[PDB]
N, C-alpha and C. Protein backbone atom coordinates (compact mmCIF):
# COMPACT_ATOMS: atom_id res chain seq x y z
N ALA A 1 83.29 106.09 5.34
CA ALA A 1 82.30 105.96 5.42
C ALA A 1 81.22 106.86 4.73
N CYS A 2 80.29 107.85 4.83
CA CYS A 2 79.38 108.26 4.05
C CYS A 2 79.51 109.04 5.36
N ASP A 3 80.26 110.64 4.62
CA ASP A 3 79.66 111.50 5.49
C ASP A 3 79.05 111.96 7.21
N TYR A 4 77.45 111.44 5.64
CA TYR A 4 76.04 111.64 6.78
C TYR A 4 75.76 110.03 6.65
N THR A 5 75.49 109.34 8.05
CA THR A 5 74.51 108.90 8.38
C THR A 5 73.31 107.70 9.12
N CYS A 6 72.26 108.54 8.25
CA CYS A 6 71.16 108.40 9.49
C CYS A 6 70.31 107.15 8.87
N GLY A 7 70.47 106.31 9.94
CA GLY A 7 69.78 104.75 10.29
C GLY A 7 70.30 104.43 8.21
N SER A 8 70.07 103.56 8.24
CA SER A 8 70.89 103.08 6.76
C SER A 8 70.42 103.84 5.59
N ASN A 9 70.31 105.61 5.93
CA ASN A 9 70.63 105.63 5.31
C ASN A 9 71.90 106.90 4.55
N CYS A 10 72.57 106.63 3.44
CA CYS A 10 73.66 108.01 3.14
C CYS A 10 73.83 108.25 2.36
N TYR A 11 74.55 109.41 3.18
CA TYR A 11 73.99 110.52 2.45
C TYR A 11 76.18 111.80 2.82
N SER A 12 75.81 112.53 1.24
CA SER A 12 77.59 112.74 1.46
C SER A 12 77.20 114.16 1.53
N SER A 13 78.00 115.03 1.82
CA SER A 13 77.95 116.68 1.53
C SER A 13 77.14 117.38 0.80
N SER A 14 77.53 116.63 -0.61
CA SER A 14 76.89 117.92 -1.66
C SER A 14 74.85 117.20 -1.52
N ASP A 15 74.45 115.91 -1.15
CA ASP A 15 73.54 116.08 -1.27
C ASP A 15 72.33 117.10 0.64
N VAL A 16 73.01 116.85 1.34
CA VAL A 16 72.94 117.80 2.48
C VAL A 16 72.86 119.20 2.19
N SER A 17 73.67 119.81 1.37
CA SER A 17 74.22 121.54 1.17
C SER A 17 72.71 120.20 -0.43
N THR A 18 72.47 119.95 -1.11
CA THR A 18 71.10 120.46 -2.16
C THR A 18 69.67 120.75 -1.07
N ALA A 19 69.42 119.75 0.11
CA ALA A 19 68.75 119.22 1.48
C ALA A 19 67.81 120.69 1.34
N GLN A 20 69.98 121.58 1.84
CA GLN A 20 70.16 122.66 2.67
C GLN A 20 69.40 124.08 1.95
N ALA A 21 69.74 124.10 0.75
CA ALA A 21 69.19 124.91 -0.65
C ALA A 21 67.86 125.29 -0.50
N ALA A 22 67.52 124.27 -0.57
CA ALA A 22 66.32 123.97 -1.33
C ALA A 22 65.24 124.51 0.15
N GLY A 23 65.56 124.06 1.04
CA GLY A 23 65.32 124.35 2.63
C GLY A 23 65.06 126.09 3.00
N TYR A 24 66.58 126.42 2.71
CA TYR A 24 66.80 127.49 2.78
C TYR A 24 65.77 128.80 1.70
N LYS A 25 65.89 128.70 0.65
CA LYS A 25 65.30 129.24 -0.95
C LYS A 25 63.73 128.80 0.08
N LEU A 26 63.11 128.04 0.52
CA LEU A 26 61.83 128.26 0.83
C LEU A 26 61.77 129.55 2.30
N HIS A 27 62.66 129.34 2.91
CA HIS A 27 63.15 130.20 3.89
C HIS A 27 63.15 131.83 3.68
N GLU A 28 63.12 132.30 2.93
CA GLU A 28 63.40 133.47 2.67
C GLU A 28 62.72 133.73 1.84
N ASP A 29 62.29 132.74 1.51
CA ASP A 29 60.85 133.34 0.59
C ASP A 29 59.81 133.13 1.21
N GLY A 30 59.44 132.99 2.83
CA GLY A 30 58.77 132.62 3.71
C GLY A 30 57.98 132.17 3.24
N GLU A 31 57.94 130.47 2.70
CA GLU A 31 57.08 129.82 1.52
C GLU A 31 57.18 128.57 2.75
N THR A 32 56.49 127.64 2.33
CA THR A 32 56.62 125.96 3.05
C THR A 32 56.26 125.41 1.50
N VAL A 33 56.50 123.82 2.18
CA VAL A 33 55.77 122.12 0.73
C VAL A 33 55.26 121.33 2.21
N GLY A 34 54.88 120.29 2.21
CA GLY A 34 54.39 119.46 2.72
C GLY A 34 53.29 119.96 3.26
N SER A 35 52.73 118.68 3.80
CA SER A 35 51.17 118.90 4.85
C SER A 35 51.83 119.57 6.50
N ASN A 36 52.99 119.37 6.83
CA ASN A 36 53.64 120.43 7.62
C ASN A 36 54.76 121.30 7.55
N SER A 37 54.27 121.82 6.13
CA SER A 37 55.47 122.87 6.14
C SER A 37 57.04 123.33 6.74
N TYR A 38 56.93 122.42 5.58
CA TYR A 38 59.28 122.93 5.52
C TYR A 38 59.03 123.61 5.28
N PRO A 39 59.72 124.41 4.78
CA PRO A 39 61.09 123.92 6.82
C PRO A 39 59.81 124.47 7.61
N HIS A 40 60.46 124.67 8.83
CA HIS A 40 59.94 124.66 9.60
C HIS A 40 60.84 124.63 11.72
N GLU A 41 60.94 126.28 12.34
CA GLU A 41 62.00 125.74 13.57
C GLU A 41 62.03 124.20 13.63
N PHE A 42 63.47 124.12 14.10
CA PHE A 42 62.87 122.94 15.03
C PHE A 42 64.45 123.43 16.16
N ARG A 43 63.32 122.46 16.30
CA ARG A 43 63.00 123.39 18.10
C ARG A 43 63.96 122.88 19.83
N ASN A 44 64.80 122.20 18.83
CA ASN A 44 65.87 121.41 19.17
C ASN A 44 65.67 120.46 20.60
N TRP A 45 64.61 120.12 20.92
CA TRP A 45 64.07 120.01 22.40
C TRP A 45 65.56 119.06 22.72
N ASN A 46 65.21 117.94 21.94
CA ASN A 46 67.14 117.45 21.96
C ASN A 46 68.89 116.97 23.08
N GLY A 47 68.66 119.07 22.51
CA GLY A 47 69.57 119.65 23.48
C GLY A 47 71.03 119.13 22.21
N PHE A 48 70.61 120.09 21.02
CA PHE A 48 71.91 119.00 20.36
C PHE A 48 73.04 120.55 20.11
N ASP A 49 74.13 119.96 20.83
CA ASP A 49 74.78 120.79 20.60
C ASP A 49 75.70 121.56 19.54
N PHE A 50 75.02 122.75 18.65
CA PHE A 50 75.25 122.88 17.39
C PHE A 50 76.04 123.83 17.72
N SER A 51 77.47 124.50 16.88
CA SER A 51 77.93 125.64 16.89
C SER A 51 77.65 127.16 15.39
N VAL A 52 77.18 126.87 15.26
CA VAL A 52 75.84 128.18 14.54
C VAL A 52 74.73 128.16 15.63
N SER A 53 74.77 129.87 15.14
CA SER A 53 73.71 130.68 15.86
C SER A 53 71.83 130.01 15.92
N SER A 54 71.50 130.10 16.67
CA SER A 54 70.00 129.84 16.40
C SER A 54 69.58 131.28 15.91
N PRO A 55 67.22 131.65 15.41
CA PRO A 55 67.09 129.78 15.28
C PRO A 55 67.92 128.94 14.13
N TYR A 56 67.78 127.52 14.90
CA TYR A 56 67.19 126.59 13.35
C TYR A 56 66.27 126.62 12.68
N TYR A 57 66.04 126.11 12.12
CA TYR A 57 64.84 125.56 10.86
C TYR A 57 65.58 124.01 10.16
N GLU A 58 64.18 123.25 10.16
CA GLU A 58 64.82 122.00 9.55
C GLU A 58 63.75 121.71 8.04
N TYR A 59 64.96 120.77 7.37
CA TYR A 59 63.94 120.21 6.07
C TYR A 59 64.47 119.77 5.89
N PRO A 60 63.09 118.30 4.91
CA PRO A 60 63.78 117.07 5.02
C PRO A 60 64.88 117.18 4.34
N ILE A 61 65.09 115.66 4.57
CA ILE A 61 66.73 115.20 3.33
C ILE A 61 65.96 113.82 3.16
N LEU A 62 65.97 113.81 2.03
CA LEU A 62 65.20 112.37 1.33
C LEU A 62 65.74 111.40 0.78
N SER A 63 65.96 109.95 1.28
CA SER A 63 66.83 108.80 1.40
C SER A 63 66.79 108.18 -0.61
N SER A 64 66.49 109.20 -1.53
CA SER A 64 65.97 109.33 -2.91
C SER A 64 66.70 109.79 -3.21
N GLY A 65 67.32 110.51 -2.22
CA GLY A 65 69.53 111.84 -3.40
C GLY A 65 67.72 112.51 -3.73
N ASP A 66 66.43 112.97 -4.04
CA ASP A 66 65.59 113.73 -4.07
C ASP A 66 64.87 115.07 -3.40
N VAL A 67 65.02 116.11 -3.97
CA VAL A 67 64.63 117.22 -2.70
C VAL A 67 63.18 116.55 -2.27
N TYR A 68 62.79 117.47 -1.23
CA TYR A 68 62.26 117.53 -0.84
C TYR A 68 60.49 118.64 -1.32
N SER A 69 59.15 117.77 -1.23
CA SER A 69 58.45 118.98 -2.71
C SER A 69 57.01 118.38 -1.87
N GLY A 70 57.07 118.68 -0.57
CA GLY A 70 55.41 118.02 0.02
C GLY A 70 54.50 116.19 0.50
N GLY A 71 56.15 115.46 -0.43
CA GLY A 71 55.38 113.87 0.31
C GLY A 71 55.69 113.60 1.58
N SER A 72 55.40 112.39 1.76
CA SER A 72 56.21 111.75 2.73
C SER A 72 57.39 112.51 3.51
N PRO A 73 58.26 113.09 4.10
CA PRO A 73 59.10 113.44 5.25
C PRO A 73 60.43 112.82 5.22
N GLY A 74 60.02 111.46 5.85
CA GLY A 74 61.26 110.13 5.93
C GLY A 74 61.40 110.76 7.50
N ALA A 75 62.25 110.00 7.94
CA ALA A 75 62.66 111.06 8.81
C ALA A 75 64.25 111.55 9.96
N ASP A 76 64.53 111.61 7.40
CA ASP A 76 66.17 112.62 8.04
C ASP A 76 65.70 114.28 7.73
N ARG A 77 66.96 115.30 8.47
CA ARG A 77 65.85 116.49 8.71
C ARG A 77 67.70 117.80 8.82
N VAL A 78 68.02 118.07 7.63
CA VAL A 78 69.20 119.36 7.77
C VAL A 78 68.96 120.09 8.67
N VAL A 79 69.62 120.64 9.43
CA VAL A 79 69.60 121.64 10.29
C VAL A 79 70.34 122.79 9.67
N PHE A 80 69.25 124.08 9.41
CA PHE A 80 70.33 125.22 9.34
C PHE A 80 69.50 127.04 10.21
N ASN A 81 70.35 127.61 10.06
CA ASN A 81 70.09 128.84 10.05
C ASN A 81 69.62 129.96 8.34
N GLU A 82 68.46 131.63 9.80
CA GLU A 82 68.66 132.11 8.99
C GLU A 82 69.82 133.04 8.21
N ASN A 83 71.61 132.76 8.26
CA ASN A 83 72.64 132.42 7.26
C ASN A 83 72.87 131.77 6.85
N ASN A 84 71.69 131.49 5.85
CA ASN A 84 71.92 129.80 5.52
C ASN A 84 73.67 128.48 6.08
N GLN A 85 73.39 129.06 7.45
CA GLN A 85 74.93 127.92 7.66
C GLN A 85 74.36 126.42 8.07
N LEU A 86 74.91 125.37 7.84
CA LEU A 86 74.50 123.61 8.61
C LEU A 86 74.76 123.91 10.24
N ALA A 87 73.68 123.31 10.31
CA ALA A 87 73.71 123.18 12.09
C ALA A 87 74.36 122.37 11.84
N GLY A 88 73.82 121.25 11.08
CA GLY A 88 73.79 120.00 11.14
C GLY A 88 72.74 118.72 11.02
N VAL A 89 72.63 117.66 10.65
CA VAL A 89 72.28 116.21 10.01
C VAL A 89 71.28 115.31 11.41
N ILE A 90 70.01 115.18 11.00
CA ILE A 90 69.51 114.52 12.53
C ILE A 90 68.36 113.40 12.29
N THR A 91 67.81 113.04 12.73
CA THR A 91 67.09 111.30 12.21
C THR A 91 66.38 111.30 13.38
N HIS A 92 64.68 110.87 13.03
CA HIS A 92 64.16 110.49 13.91
C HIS A 92 64.61 108.63 14.40
N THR A 93 65.09 108.04 13.11
CA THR A 93 65.19 106.64 13.48
C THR A 93 66.35 106.56 14.83
N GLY A 94 65.95 105.20 14.95
CA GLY A 94 66.98 105.01 16.54
C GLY A 94 66.55 105.90 17.64
N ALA A 95 65.25 107.35 17.07
CA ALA A 95 65.06 107.53 18.36
C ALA A 95 63.71 107.35 19.07
N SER A 96 63.85 107.70 20.53
CA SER A 96 62.18 106.72 21.00
C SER A 96 60.94 107.95 19.97
N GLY A 97 59.83 107.85 20.55
CA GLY A 97 58.99 109.46 19.84
C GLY A 97 59.79 110.12 18.63
N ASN A 98 59.07 111.24 19.19
CA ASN A 98 59.15 112.64 18.71
C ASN A 98 60.91 113.46 18.43
N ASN A 99 61.34 112.82 19.31
CA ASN A 99 63.13 112.82 20.11
C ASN A 99 64.26 112.60 18.23
N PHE A 100 65.03 112.81 18.88
CA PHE A 100 65.60 113.05 16.92
C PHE A 100 67.47 112.25 18.17
N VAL A 101 67.24 112.33 17.15
CA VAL A 101 69.47 111.84 18.00
C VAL A 101 70.16 111.91 15.83
N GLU A 102 70.82 112.67 16.02
CA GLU A 102 71.74 113.21 14.96
C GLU A 102 72.59 112.40 14.72
N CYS A 103 72.58 112.03 12.91
CA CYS A 103 73.09 112.07 12.08
C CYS A 103 74.75 110.98 12.96
N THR A 104 75.08 110.18 12.69
CA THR A 104 76.75 110.16 12.29
C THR A 104 77.54 110.04 11.03
């Protein structure tokens, strides 16, 4: 099985690291990309029990394996914190409204 499965997208740990790394660089630099300004704070309204400290930040992870650069973000997000630690991988797919479910 894939390291991470979001909806029908299969992601490896390196895929996640790659998206995480792109998101983190933008974060430490105070910059963003896309009409929705990624990365931005992940509010965790769904109450996921992450083991790393908050605040959390979400950055899109794309089904093409490409690093997000401002297009349509799709449903998948990697969540990380200012210590550059991976909090988790989440997706809108399978959820209702603006809610999220953790990828499996």
